[PDB]
Amino acid sequence: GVFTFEDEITSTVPPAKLYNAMKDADSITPKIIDDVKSVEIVEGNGGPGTIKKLTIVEDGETKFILHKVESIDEANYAYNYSVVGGVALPPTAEKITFETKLVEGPNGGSIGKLTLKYHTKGDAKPDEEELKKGKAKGEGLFRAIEGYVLANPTQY
């Protein structure tokens, strides 16, 4: 079945800037986040259907994660992608989708909105430990992209 929920996060960076920065996440993320070593395109032109392989290291072991780009709407500061393989997909789960939107926040910042859709195989229930771990990783990612923009004000 599908399990859906929604979370929010804030930034002092305005949404057009932050959105443009999110497009360069493949190049930014490896620099800032210790564990992420590379992000490579396995197939596609970056738009919908593109498959990406993320290489990380946790506790000395090199692991990989597979993302698929679902859709892109630049007018509405929106990017949707799914985890479709690797360590971040648990064996009980078919797929985990992240639907992301940025909106104008108060005080010239941004509000980021995430809808998370966790698709399970059969009667299996979503893994709470993997969810908790996921939220921490997603937060980190957002802060890293924000951090880059704040630390490099001339770019964007």
Q: Exactly one of 3, 24, 114, 156 binds ligand QUE (CB under 6 A); which one?
A: 114
Q: Give the shortest CB-89-to-ligand QUE separation in angstroms.
A: 9
Residue owning tokens 């290291």:
57
Residue owning tokens 């104008």:
104
What binding mask, one character per residue, do residues 17-36 give for ligand QUE by CB under 6 A, x or -?
Answer: -----x--xx--x-----xx
| Crossing angle of the two packed helices 25-32 and 15-23, in degrees rounded to 10 | 80
Tell me: does residue 134 bind ligand QUE (CB under 6 A).
Answer: yes
| Alpha helix (H) residue ranges in the chain | 15-23, 25-32, 128-151
Query: Which of Na ion, ligand QUE, none binds 86 (CB below 5-8 Å, type-dependent)?
Result: none
Q: Exactly one of 1, 2, 4, 7 binds ligand QUE (CB under 6 A); which one?
A: 7
Tell me: does residue 70 bind ligand QUE (CB under 6 A).
Answer: no
Residue owning tokens 């509000």:
111
Q: Give the shortest CB-141-to-ligand QUE separation in angstroms.
A: 5
Among 88, 87, 70, CA closest to 79: 70
What binding mask, one character per residue, do residues 57-96 give for Na ion by CB under 5 A, x or -?
Answer: ----------------------------------------
| Contact status, residue 112 vs residue 142, Cβ threshold 8 Å | yes
Residue owning tokens 């399970």:
120
Determine the Cα–Cα distance for residues 33 and 140; give it in Å rounded to an integer.
8
Cβ count near 33 (within 10 Å): 16
Q: Contact positions toward ligand QUE, by CB under 6 A?
A: 7-9, 22, 25-26, 29, 35-36, 39, 54, 56, 58, 65, 79, 88, 98, 100, 112-114, 116, 131, 134-135, 137-139, 141-142
Q: Which residues bind Na ion (CB under 5 A)?
A: 30
